Amino acid sequence: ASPFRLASAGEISEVQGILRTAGLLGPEKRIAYLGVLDPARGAGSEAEDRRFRVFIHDVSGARPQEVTVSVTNGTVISAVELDTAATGELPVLEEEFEVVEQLLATDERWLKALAARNLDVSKVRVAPLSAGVFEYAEERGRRILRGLAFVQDFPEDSAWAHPVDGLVAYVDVVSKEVTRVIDTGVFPVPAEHGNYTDPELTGPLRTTQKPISITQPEGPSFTVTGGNHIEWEKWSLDVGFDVREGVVLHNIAFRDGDRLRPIINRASIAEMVVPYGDPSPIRSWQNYFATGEYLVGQYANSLELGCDCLGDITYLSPVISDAFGNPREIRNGICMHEEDWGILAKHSDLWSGINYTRRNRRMVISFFTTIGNYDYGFYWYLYLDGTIEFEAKATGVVFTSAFPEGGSDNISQLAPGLGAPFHQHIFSARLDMAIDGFTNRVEEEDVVRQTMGPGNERGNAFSRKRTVLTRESEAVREADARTGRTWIISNPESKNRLNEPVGYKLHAHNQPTLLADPGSSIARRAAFATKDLWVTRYADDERYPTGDFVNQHSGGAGLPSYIAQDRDIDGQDIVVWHTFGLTHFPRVEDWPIMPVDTVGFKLRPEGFFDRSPVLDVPAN
Amino acid sequence: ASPFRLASAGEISEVQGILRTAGLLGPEKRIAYLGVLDPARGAGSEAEDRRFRVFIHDVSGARPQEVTVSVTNGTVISAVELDTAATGELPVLEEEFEVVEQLLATDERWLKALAARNLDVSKVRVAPLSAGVFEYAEERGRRILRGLAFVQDFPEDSAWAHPVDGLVAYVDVVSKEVTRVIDTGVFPVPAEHGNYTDPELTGPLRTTQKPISITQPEGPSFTVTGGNHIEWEKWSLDVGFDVREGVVLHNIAFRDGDRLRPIINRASIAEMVVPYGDPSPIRSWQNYFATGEYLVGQYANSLELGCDCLGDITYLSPVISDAFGNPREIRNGICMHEEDWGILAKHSDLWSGINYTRRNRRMVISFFTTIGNYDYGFYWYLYLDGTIEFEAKATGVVFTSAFPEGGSDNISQLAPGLGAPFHQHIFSARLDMAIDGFTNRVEEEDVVRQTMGPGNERGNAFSRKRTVLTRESEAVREADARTGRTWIISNPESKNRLNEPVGYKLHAHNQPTLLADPGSSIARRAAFATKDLWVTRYADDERYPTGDFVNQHSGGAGLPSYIAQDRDIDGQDIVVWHTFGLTHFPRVEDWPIMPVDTVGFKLRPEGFFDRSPVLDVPAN
Numbered sequence A, B: 001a002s003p004f005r006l007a008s009a010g011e012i013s014e015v016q017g018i019l020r021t022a023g024l025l026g027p028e029k030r031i032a033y034l035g036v037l038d039p040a041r042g043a044g045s046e047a048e049d050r051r052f053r054v055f056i057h058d059v060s061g062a063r064p065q066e067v068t069v070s071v072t073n074g075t076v077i078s079a080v081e082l083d084t085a086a087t088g089e090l091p092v093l094e095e096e097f098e099v100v101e102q103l104l105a106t107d108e109r110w111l112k113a114l115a116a117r118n119l120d121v122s123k124v125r126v127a128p129l130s131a132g133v134f135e136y137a138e139e140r141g142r143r144i145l146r147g148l149a150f151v152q153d154f155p156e157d158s159a160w161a162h163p164v165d166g167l168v169a170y171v172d173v174v175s176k177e178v179t180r181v182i183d184t185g186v187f188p189v190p191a192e193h194g195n196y197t198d199p200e201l202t203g204p205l206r207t208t209q210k211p212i213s214i215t216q217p218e219g220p221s222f223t224v225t226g227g228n229h230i231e232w233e234k235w236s237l238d239v240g241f242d243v244r245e246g247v248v249l250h251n252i253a254f255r256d257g258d259r260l261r262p263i264i265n266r267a268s269i270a271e272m273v274v275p276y277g278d279p280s281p282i283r284s285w286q287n288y289f290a291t292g293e294y295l296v297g298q299y300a301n302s303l304e305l306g307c308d309c310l311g312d313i314t315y316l317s318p319v320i321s322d323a324f325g326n327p328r329e330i331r332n333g334i335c336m337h338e339e340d341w342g343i344l345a346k347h348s349d350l351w352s353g354i355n356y357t358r359r360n361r362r363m364v365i366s367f368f369t370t371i372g373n374y375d376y377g378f379y380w381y382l383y384l385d386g387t388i389e390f391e392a393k394a395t396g397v398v399f400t401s402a403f404p405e406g407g408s409d410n411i412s413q414l415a416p417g418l419g420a421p422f423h424q425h426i427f428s429a430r431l432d433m434a435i436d437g438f439t440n441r442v443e444e445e446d447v448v449r450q451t452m453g454p455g456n457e458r459g460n461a462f463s464r465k466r467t468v469l470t471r472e473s474e475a476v477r478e479a480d481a482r483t484g485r486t487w488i489i490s491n492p493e494s495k496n497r498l499n500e501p502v503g504y505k506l507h508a509h510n511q512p513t514l515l516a517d518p519g520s521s522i523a524r525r526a527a528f529a530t531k532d533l534w535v536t537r538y539a540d541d542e543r544y545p546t547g548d549f550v551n552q553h554s555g556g557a558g559l560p561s562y563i564a565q566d567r568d569i570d571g572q573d574i575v576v577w578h579t580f581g582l583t584h585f586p587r588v589e590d591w592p593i594m595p596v597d598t599v600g601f602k603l604r605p606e607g608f609f610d611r612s613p614v615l616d617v618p619a620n
């Protein structure tokens, strides 16, 4: 029914059938990406034609293809051959990651490197990482993965505690060749284990934690209809899921009186990159785009009740395609629940004698993914007062290396001889805005200090200024915490009762952006990460800040290319791209398993309503 | 038993008796401040002498006094006459705020101003505010309060909705004279009411919220002994309460194996200033130090179970003295409870096949105070991983004015003709550090970008740098969000197993600091608010960043004076003073009652432990 419904197992199977029938999915083909296409702007087609987009990989080396199909009409709408050496390789297949360790196990150079370190190949695990784009001419036209070694002493051992430094190998996953084996020298392999479930390391488990029971006797306050349409405390939205981006929120709107007022048309984390800052040749190439290269939704965890999600939880089990086009369900991959959120508003008035207190609550929509040693949680929150917030939670096991005898300026020591290279976790939130409709504009708001003098004799006055970003070329902005800089998305054609354009204010955490030298490969490939805010004019094919094909793709696509069009964004259908991230200098406390660290952003109403929208909240 | 125990009603009664019998509490005397004194450095002297510090005001204009008494021996240890014209006026008495409206009610100038506006004097409430600035000549030596008018139509009416602009009066509360009435012109009094409990404004109340039950079948995981000593998940501390500062945390320590390791000796919000940025003569002097001038602890609210504090709550009911020395209990003034705090650590490992998830929780200690129209919540959090955090919650009703015809650059419009002047809420957290002992030092840590070239050919490297603050003259620091600046408090004499000084890292929110012109009276009186972080050498008499007698003092007192001593702070008993605040440009959504907005800071372990201190947390 709803054109925003989740993809069904049936639709996935249908796509597979359509491709097979078209002669586009024979035995040598693989689905590297498959997702449902969002409806185009405006009620074009009389009805809603369900379409899917697919990236088809060829294991024999033939050029891949991008194909769009109509599952409703059973037809291929478009199919284009891709020149990967130019526009980029398709995302990595889960089945290719396994290829690396296997191939290296039979390579003389690799075996010789392990023998030199007295390491048994059968106990050496190899972490397969994306290759990026550097100075290796032979990699032109090759589908490459780079491997870093870790020793696993036994089946349940945490290999991350035993990094094999000074060694790295490059592999052509298609031709099944080891292009290079680099050995910069033998480094002692850290000896201590990092088995956080081992009693000798955890010591006796504490028995002081009493239980906390969180329940909802009458059930949750939100309703779920059409499989993924949420209605909660005036909020309305559709919870989508894409194998690349993960959870995606659609049609976020708020009920104000007799009308449903749109706020954000589509909200997603369109990219997430983890750049490493260790200049060692062994890892200086290390940068993985979880979203763009790996597809985070694909690795979403099945969330356990009471453990991952506590309270009255309503689950969604999104379906994705496997490498052959078969539907695969991610059971309980999405948690949805509401939670108490402290005091919302409070005032004890002496004159009126009235004491008033109201509590707040928020709707939570989340999923958690695992990328090798890292695990990331994605959380979207909706508050009673109209605030929208996103929060990323980073945990898992830190990527390790050896710790240099002479110390290091780019690595921290976690244990004897065990290092943790410095790195960042930078996200890009793509917010297709729709403040009271699609006619929107962005204003940069700065606090303004005033000089003592005429009109300000006491020197106490302070103000603010707003600058409307009118063209894309002027919409690449930097944060400025010192001046309390924020960005307001308003609708110049929709005013509140005080005759002011309605709006929402974006509050950033103002964390450092990409630190890499501007001339670096990563600065170019992750250009979006160098600035805090970008505003573009909406366009169907501008989906990710890094373009459609990130794997082994040079700069040239993404935000810098979109912005160049210098389109009008003053009172138009626009998209805000907010960069935010964490800069991680690992601490001893992050070992053997790290406690969650967080980062995000939020948007609060700014003259969107005619007064507080929570005056109708009961005392309960 | 414990020298850090809360003051008892009996102790207050004893102080009253001691003062009375000593002839220091005559009919004209008033207790402007009364608090127990913390133990001095060195608890070697068995059995501590319970001493109280008292500020005695004299309503006849006679010299006030600072008296120290011993309730243990029942004697007056010291009594010093105060020269208010030199060292500042004593905190405002609750009974003085009341005299302002009463005195104005009989002043011909005031009555004429109201008559011209057709306002019934019996319906005009007067918000009594501190002098706000120091300048006027005739005010020197004179104990002044200023008054701003608001119309209350009926007993339960919210007067804040009806400000009477263009009018302000100054009152000498001791001589009981109206020194001046300034009328700059008539402004319409905003017509709409702001009664948030009126169905007319709230509309039909929501019936969509289902209950959320939060319980603890086996009780809380924390224990409370000695009335205020808390032990929870390895944490140990004493919860104190002072009429000026409110909740104060003492001896914060963490159990690491067989050792109780100290982290912070005393933590408190030593000051909180609210400067207004409207250049109008009616309010350009407006600045109130809630802590220093009003005493926030005095106005702490009684917190209702299931409303202000939800869950399994353990209350503390601190006792304070009234203006006459009588004990007054603040029933349920302090809430204490633990709450679930999502996922603590998580990792699903492919190689080991082990899936691990642990949840986090925080211990919460809080109180809420009401200062006229504003209501502020103070929250201290202790996390399982060793993190300590403070969070202030600002709510209540915004201070209003008229919204001038033609607009304003320093006031926002909340309703027809109703304005809300721009202002800030800036706090100062005084942290008497004790990282593994009193020998501490502070290092400013900045992220360091590196240029591509030799040793960094790919231009991916990035580092960090730490600068030790060795003398107070170089310990006045500013934030730098761009470089991810933080401050680490370490103990150079206590190292972790990796031979590195143990420490804790302070993460600020990097919000704007005091915006007023550098030459303003407020910039001098609240100099602490102009810089993000100050470090001083510990001293018994250096309690507040604004000095002991903030009211009507000329400026420079507190931090600027302490810092001028230029003492050694490199490996010494030091105190960190962190300035943090909110810059408020009121929104329509903040009217008629504002939803909570927050600010805070946190400190996380930085090489304090030898590995993660939460490996012993059970799965459950």
Ligand SMILES: [Cu+2]
Binding pocket: A394, A423, A424, A425, A584
């Ligand atoms: Cu990290």
Ligand SMILES: [Cu+2]
Binding pocket: B394, B423, B424, B425, B584
């Ligand atoms: Cu405010």
